[model samples]
Target: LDRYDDAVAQFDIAKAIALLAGNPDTGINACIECCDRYTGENRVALRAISIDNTLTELTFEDLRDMSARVGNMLADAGISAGDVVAGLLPRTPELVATILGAWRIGAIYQPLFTAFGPKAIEQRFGTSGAKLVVTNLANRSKLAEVENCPRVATILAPGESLPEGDIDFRAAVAAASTECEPVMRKGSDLFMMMSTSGTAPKGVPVPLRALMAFGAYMRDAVGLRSDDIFWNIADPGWAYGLYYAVTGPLLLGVPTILNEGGFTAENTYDIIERLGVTSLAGSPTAFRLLIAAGPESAARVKGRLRVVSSAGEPLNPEVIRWFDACLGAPIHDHYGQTELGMVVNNHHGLEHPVRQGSAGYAMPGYRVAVLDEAGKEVGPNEPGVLAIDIDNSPLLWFTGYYKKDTPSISGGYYRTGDTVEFEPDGSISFIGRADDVITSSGYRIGPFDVESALLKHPAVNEAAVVGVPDPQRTEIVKAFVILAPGFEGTPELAEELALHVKKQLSAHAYPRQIDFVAELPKTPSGKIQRFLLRKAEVEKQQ
Candidate 1:
């Protein structure tokens, strides 16, 4: 087992080199073609959904041909190599086809969230310099309202009719020959640009080599097999969804399950049972929703499931145990950011026991250290900034901000902006964001610690903790919570919950103020927008 593990690690490195040196589309196509060769022999690659509730089970050949055709169509549309094209479609077979097709033609793909309003859409389009925008009818109307959106050269929509002057995506691809190869691209070439979650919109340009390196590392770190029916229940607009859901699976020749419906516990349960997904990835928010819906929804996931991973936020121990009991598998927590893709993940294949509240060790080829304000590595159990060492590690990959000419890296370490504590067992526990840490009366408190304690209560469905300005304590930890269905958020309940947190965690970390809300503000990627919460609290004081 040890020797085989080493062999797999070596294979990942070789694949990463090839993906970096070769054309991304060609590399992706070759992987799909290889999967096709073993099809129907316990190798089902992709189960995609079409518009009319039709299932499109793609063999490797189908994916390759479709990718080639899409590439040809893009080339025919005058989209040259290295040009950027934006995709604003929902999760569907067409969306996957569009992404692969764009790469096959060597055009960089810029993903715009389908839920974005006109202003947000326009801002991203303007910032990315996208020559073409592929979207559905619903999003096309939204795009039309964005005023100075650089005369979109081509507008391709899926389904029967194209809006006014636009072209049908399928018809355009059908007219072109499927024999052309992708343009030769270096690892350093731009592959995709993902946006960050902030008031000011900024895109992070990911180089082909860096993306390949991330995908390759994640494939082994997560124990993703070609035979595994992997499903990442994250929207494609986010980095997790774009990288792990679309790019990584395709690059590794693994079958990815796509569901077009919104995230509901019932829908998730049904999808897992129907698709027989071996590996499932989702966010802590999604898991909380699933848990709130009840155990029956989770019970549908029987023994066939191999790995269940969670990210986007720190997970609660209660939620982990709930899934472990229902799915017969532990919920593994991983950590990364929009700037870095899958830097640290729990190795599913390894024999290490799952720590209750820790995001597993640093992945192979990646180095993680807890550093203080002075950038010196901190000792074990000390809360400090979680940073990636770029000098010694082969896994660093930040191309730079999209609009800014200067890169975000300083010295050798890429500042993650997150606080964590390293354990002696090689696991890392997530503290709150560095900026969100509350300092009250000389004591430092991470919001996650308080929030985790609050989540242990039965009435609490979701919670967001922030440091509110307080003249007495300098800054006091304030918690905003959303209750479970049918639960009342009375003043009495709020005080009870506050006391519950104090008893669960340290007395000093208890939330001094508690507010009840229907939902916590969140970024498109499902991360709690704590900054917004902090702003709201400050405004209330004023």
Candidate 2:
């Protein structure tokens, strides 16, 4: 077993706490630990790549100075400890500095995705009660559309005009002194207020103590070695990106990449080849896109990648095999949610065998179980709700959503609302979300299995399966698909795809109705929102 996995095998709560945080309540500044604690100030902290192919190398000192200036600027604006500083910027140096700066001042950093519309941004702002919003020109216009928006600080280049009643990010940073000290904060103090993306967006307060979990994941699951060049392609606006891409690497003092450009297979391949990225993590949608790019694009950089991982959604087995055959490494699938960081994973830092269809066993400092409706443990291969044992999971810092009750937790277990089956070896296979299961002809089916089977067809690029209300079967299998290039969504092709799933999986599990669409509804983090499709189907039936 890996050293980290071995060390925490016995699972001593106090000892685990000591390893990650010496004194949990002691005052500490996230900015100082992420930047000033490093001896090699000249070492690359971030290799920021812009949309125009501009590469900017920033060191620890570069980030430290910039963050200090930003802290001073925020202080001048009357922002203080526990204040919210929401960033609506893309993956640039400014966005990174904004997060560090917020922590430097003992304030909470709330990330807003650049692609979010006016209502999405407004909902998050209202949820967090954000005091200030920092954005660039490309995204600033959306703020005007938001009613009762917060104070805005816009990032602009030289000679760019600032909007009325908005603070200029460049001018403010330049005028402020770069000698701000790190603010003291307790381990329980809020560092960020993360919001969920459901029908009712609620804020989740992230404490400084959560750093321990984030760092542990980097060490064990990500397995970032000193010599490894790491890049987490997840956007910082969401949980996975904010936790791993920004905070995780900083906690470990490892050099990480930040790409300002949008996701494309060609651009991604170029960055990996040019930057020499060894360890990579991203959404499953991205991996499937690479598969859709065909074998020729995959051949360009086959053997260069060392470690690859997928989170946000269950990775289809077809995507995993494509990576092993083309990229020379299997993409490890991990499971977690907005309420919890990664609890189950395939540890790259550990010496454990990889299970093909299961997300590896629970990580250190946490214990997971497949539980029945009564919160009792289920036998292996029996599908049940996956949950974390709150009493036993030492690293769990989430008390509840910000000023809200979490009905999801009951009977001393924090239910994930995800249905899963476990093996005797502790490996867990995801079935689907509780609401995602389909019942047709008195048979219960998981959409993930059918979706995985559909991806086996060459014509199918992406697929999302849902259960629609049917008078005869109570519910029937329906699929929304995006076809690959060179393939048309003809009736014959649709029938072929449906039959293909029936052969690959089971007849009852195959989608009887298939709808071809240009795109599927997705979150900013690239997770497919099947609930949307399910809702639409219900409306149609109504």
Candidate 3:
């Protein structure tokens, strides 16, 4: 493979995708690709790093045989091909097995985020109508909230003390054979249905074909080294972790870590030190939280982690700066959405400069462009809506939503509602969402810049900015802030905070109104819910 360059370095993006998205004539099965074909008979696949600071390694053979048994058990329970099975457990070894086992039977698996409440989980199940839902004590009872979940015949509980209408997962698997043959799936087979929230089949359910794009990206864009020990700390229940941390790495036979529940700086640093982690990928929130954990843990991971990458929300430059100083590496921002796994990334393998504010070049297999409202590509340094060339981009595999028309695609491009700017060399710099921009008087302000500026202040911990409707200026910038310890919500504090932003950013972009709160409303994946904040303001006014 040639080194990264915008103009040259011609890597066959389609051929790479074809290899990962195995042929239908040859019986392409994701289970076989992920766990079966590690021809190295003795090669280890997963390292289960316990939350209690324990470690256990499982080989490919262990998973293959174990997954076969689980598949056989599902067959015994009448879980036929095309049936839906949902996993609501934490990032444990069992959840990984469940995903593989679901694929073994050709059953579509949906990962219900572990952090979701009863209502959120219930909506995913009730809407999808899962045949059998897998869960633990922590979230199992949440199912009872659904009045009548369609086709929900069974619940597989791994932990003891099973709830009513549930089966013991371990005991069932204990009696099944380990020689069950996996179902031969096609390139276009529906693999999983994931939700971003709300009661609908809104979040795109990924197919087997998407793996080509996801796998290629881990190497070219995400910068996963050949020998670097890689482990992703993002929530496995959602996109980044499930897409790359588990499935994408499996495409290349890359070994990954499945950690135990509970998060703390002490255990995280210990995991890195004890495990000798060279490559690491995670959520921006996690890195910021690591910053909150302070300098002691920073010293442990500094210089130890060779490759540092982030996905999900936009990376804060301040967090990147903090890591560069403390960890001896810069945090590269990779941008993508629930519909698309990862399209743009600051490549770790590239000799190209990893600019602090930019979201890097259009990743291999994606031709990302900034386009105006008319669906035409904009000029250099022009702010416009970000989109992918659906006609030419071979890595773009998402055809449509589960039951809805492709919600965001238009013209020949897959429009990502995110607003961004394109440089002369094609690197995309994120501005804000289409509706998230604050228009006050004649100036257009992005919440990301405001939030990023807010994060730099010592007193602020987490912050969100929204454009509240105003009689005078159409929409005024209103900030909802979560203060650090010892800070209180006072008019004096708000006055000073406004002044702080004016000095840090342009004077016009500063929030006119600042409200302090204990915490900001966030998605299960850790993205701040800016709409919720805007809605609160409307409701309060009414």
Candidate 4:
């Protein structure tokens, strides 16, 4: 276990970046570097597991060829350097292929959620200007008549009556050669387009330097090891998933398991037992669900899992005790958002004493502070916006948002919209998010997206969405609606609206509960006060 202060000071950020750098004078393709470090024929690169318990283990050699084939197919289809390529799929090997292939060609990889409906797809696709999208048949149907995304000339998927023009992924990859070529891109080159925030901020163009950020977390926070059988339970659909599950693991040359099925207690346990998973990074919601599934499952996973980590939201205090009781290792909660790489973590391989409430200390390469509105660092216990010291943060290399200059950086720091307080011991404690996004079932539900979906219904005149507390999910999407003059809100209508949102946005975005009201709380200036409704819901509990 490395001393926290010694690890941060002794580590040379520049030299570390150079180690992963592809070629001298040419910046790195993380895939090339990942594969280069490990060329052993039998060394397992990925374990692609199926719901039926089918485990397909691919070695470094296998991935090199497979990724090359995927890239060759893209080249054959005219996807060149600096273009945009997207994938809408689950955590399948094909999805990994899509990412590697895109990067192999110097094309920015864009991740489209399989759960996304047409509107969500439209917004993300249009913003990225993706030249191609690789998805399955189910996701292909979700793309309605979106015009601006006309840049998308090709669709690659399988089992098709075909949506106008679609090529089978298997067929395309098979027809291509096994020639692998590394595209030389600068460290500042845009590597992928990610959805950072839910509502206001749309797309985040992660640069090659972004790999450095994740690598830092993977090492210092996650303590990823070459011998570790790692499995990040977060979905590859979002940032946490993409960063740790795929990119972070690959960067460290660690063998990781990608489960085909969505998170179920039975499935999660089965994978760990089968794969001999020693380390894991999952969402707080999943840990809660695992807890709900009963202590037996958590107990059974004791010997296999050496460490348990949580991210995305502030874990309920009890969850920590649950892991400690069942698995013998308490869930270590880490804090970070989409734009900012992980800053605070309860490091596993460290001698730093665990502070009961703290989310560990500020990790290496990042100096975190709770700052007042005026950008001044506040005293301990002084609650303020959680901000990262950008200039001093050695690992801080996040360029502005994609196709836009206005960044989240303010007052010489990147202001995390979340509220937190710096402890007297220099550790940080979580506070509520200042935004309206709901953290339900580990999915970040954007209220604006859900409200827009509600407005589509003719019966709805005005709508607002807020997250209310639930047992399993930290919060559940609850919406308040005002019906039109002739229309009425009934149980049937609420069901319909929920289904409408599920269809219009994503399966996860639908509001589980709805209340029809004559009016919604608002400021005199006209902004709908979501905090008021949320506060009222809390006061009801008292």
Candidate 5:
């Protein structure tokens, strides 16, 4: 086994080698490199598309050429290194080019989701102090609303015909030299900023080193092999897409599959089968949606899969079992956040027994503990706050809140807002968020337990459990559900579900109030935005 530091160094060197080689191995190696060298090597590293099926494939050589062209375009427009370039493009090859182009010259890349309205777009652009925006003509209307912002320098659009004053993004790339060298960058240099769900603050800027570290750890520890056809199946606008979908695979020199289609079990299974994807990373929501879509959709996949991993939210054991039975592969549950890129995961090759309701062991170099409110470590089977050993070096953790006051850290441990139980077997079972834990008549309830129980019901499609304000019980377990097609959401169904949960768990853990919804509020990455549900519950009480 390699030492941690040695492994990191080797990972970085592998990335550089891949960038230099421009082969499939280099594609995989890019996920491990930490330096700025080979930034302008135009080799085909990514392939992406749009909703309308507009396809583009970017090679490392193509990337090298485009970065110079785009960098020159930005530089000519008075946007230079150290400046921020905000992109509002859809999931296309240009988005990849824009980010690499901006980074090639040392400017930080800020990705704005196409789903965001004008107000949301302006808020992020203003907050990031982005001087320029790259987008297509389809999204010009959104930019028109905020044309007056002082930091706004220019808007570059795709194709030959751009808006009157805006430059043609493609034209600039064509005009710039394809052989330009990249500026030297440090690991600490800011590369990208990503937003987290909630009203807390805008996105946080992640350093180049942290992103490199994240990709490296994912490649080495998570076992993203070079031969594996990786597919993150998340939006590039989110951190998972940005890290794993775009940068991670590109850094590693792997040929990644980008699915522009919406999340549906049929389409997902088709894509995976068509692409012969070996490595799959996505949220629990994806797995649940696929399971609901049925087993036939995944029946074709036999043994080509190397690793199946889930994050974003705690996975229900039922979904795990469903996939295991259908795909004949274990779904590895992982835990991490936008602030910290995959700190804990079920490592490949370690071969730990798959626990039914746990998120697996603490990732290598990550010292995690379940601690109580008093900051004391909890005994096995005791629920407490999940904390990371801060002294180990914040390699993949976010540097700090972007342009906001940073949170206070205590005793070399960064307290995650998540609550969990430490099992005697060294596995950590995720409970709900600390603030979201349901306390009912002196019985503490984690939403995961109730949600897991709901998933076992055949008629249930998806479920979100939250604590509601209750006068008698202080807080009662309430569930919002999306029933499977043909499964009526009648009062009888609700009662049946409640009774089912009562039988699966303790009687006290049964959801008292059950409401059927077409869909639950979710982040772009498909994680249930329970805070929204909690907010709605509070407003209803008011």
Candidate 6:
């Protein structure tokens, strides 16, 4: 930790680049950097756990050979560098191979979540100009729904008969030669085409130089040790999972756990207990569900986990407390967006005091500031948009969305659109997103504060707060909640919940109206979609 603190304190771009990759003049390949360079004899790279509880381990030697074969197959199909190769697959060996194969040929890889619908799939692939999409029979039918699909070819995963115009992945890999050399790409060259998580998706090109920042996050924030069994419970379709789970661990030449099964509290506990997982990272939604699973479940894996982290949304203090009491580990909340791999985090590599409501400090090599509407830096405790100081942030790589050319930077800072305030101690406290803030009776309110208070109640399982239309105060705070098991959504419970927030947080910030629902709208990546709630409320007003 002292070494990490010193390296970050004395940050230099040249030293950072040299530490991660050899040299920019010689050019670098992501496959070689992540796969070929780490050829320790019988060194494990991935520990894949199937949905049926089967374990499959693959070494770097195995990955290097297989990815080479996959690369040769793509090359035979006329695919070359600077092309787009999308994968609509889950957490399987084939998915991992496809990503490495694309990078091996200098092609940009686009990862699509298996849970995505036809439209979601179409929106991303359509805009990406993808030359190929690799999927299995189970997910192949969804591609048929895309009337304007942009992919020129489809490669089916192993098993089942292939459809017309589709190539068998395993057969092609087996038939191809394994001597394909990795295509060298410049450090600033694009390697991945990612889409934003908002309603209107925009393509984001991730360059090879960004790997420096990703590696820094793994070294400093995650603190992946040689002995720790690390697992990040995020899908590859999103940024966090792809950056940290897949690339970051590989950058450090460490084996990472890849789970094929979806998230379940019982499954999470079972994996932790069975695999002896020491370090864990996941979404706040997943942690909240574990809380809903009750203390007994938490007790099963107590004292097994050494470090736990939460991202995707603001972590409730109640949830953090639950982990502290039950699991004997506190949950460290991290903050970042798709454009930036985690910038602000409660770093495990650095020794720092755990702040209750803060998202820790900005990661080493990055500088962040909260600015007012006039594009000026705000004083402590003043809420404003969180912005990255472009000139000062040496690790910043994002320029703009792929081919969009839209102006996103203002006043020499890239505004992140997330609202936050700096604490007196330099910790950053998260407010809601810029559009998610609510103004009622001339007081601007952040939903996370009220929601965190509601989560402290025993009966609450999940909660989402929003501003509903009102004539008197312009808008009023409304809460949509999901109760825990055995708790019914009755009028008495609603009144008790509202009063609980009033007493726990503030009187004016408490929800004036409460609605009990079975579920809240969320992104596939487990982010709460507050805009949808706001839209529903506006419809009611009409």
Ranking by lDDT: 2, 6, 4, 3, 1, 5
Q: Kindly provide the TM-score of model 6 when superposed on the true structure, using C-alpha atoms.
A: 0.82
Write one digit per residue (lDDT tens) for candidate 5, span 370-406: 7777888888767788888776543545656776765
Q: Each model's number of backbone clashes?
A: 1, 1, 0, 0, 27, 0
Model 1 steric clash total = 1
Residue 135 deviation, candidate 5, in Å?
0.9
Which prediction has more favorable lDDT, 1 or 2? 2
For model 6, the stretches where C-alpha displacement exceeds 4 angstroms are: 3-8, 150-159, 432-542
Better of 2 and 5 by lDDT: 2
lDDT per residue for candidate 4 within 312-413, as digits (tens), equals 766555577778788876578788877776888888756576755566788887878888878888998676888888887878766567777645676688
| Better by TM-score, candidate 5 or 2 | 2
Worst 10 contiguous positions by lDDT, candidate 1? 28-37
Off by over 4 Å in 1: 1-44, 150-161, 405-408, 433-542
Please, what are the lDDT tens digits per residue for candidate 1 over residues 115-144? Answer: 989988878877788877777766777888
Regions of candidate 2 where Cα sits further than 4 Å from its true position: 1-8, 13-22, 39-41, 433-542
TM-scores of the candidates in the order shown: 0.77, 0.82, 0.80, 0.78, 0.74, 0.82
- Model 2 lDDT-worst window of ten: 15-24
- Colliding residue pairs in candidate 3: none
What's the lDDT of the predicted structure labeled candidate 4? 0.77
Runs of candidate 5 exceeding 4 Å displacement = 1-44, 49-57, 147-161, 433-542
The global C-alpha lDDT for each of the candidates, from Candidate 1 onward, is 0.72, 0.84, 0.76, 0.77, 0.69, 0.83
**Most lDDT-accurate candidate:** 2
Sort all candidates by TM-score, best to worst. Answer: 2, 6, 3, 4, 1, 5
lDDT of 2 by residue, 1-542 (tens): 45544755766766645644234676767786677676354888989999898999999888988889999999998789899999998999889899999989999999998889999988888888889999998888999899858899999987998999999888999898989988888889889889888655888899888888888788889888878889999999999999999988877889889998989998899999999999999997677678879889979889988899789776655577789998897688777777788888888887776865567878888888889868898997777988899988888877788977898888888888777777766677765454547889899999989999988888888999998998988998999999999998899998998899889998789899999988876432345657657866774554
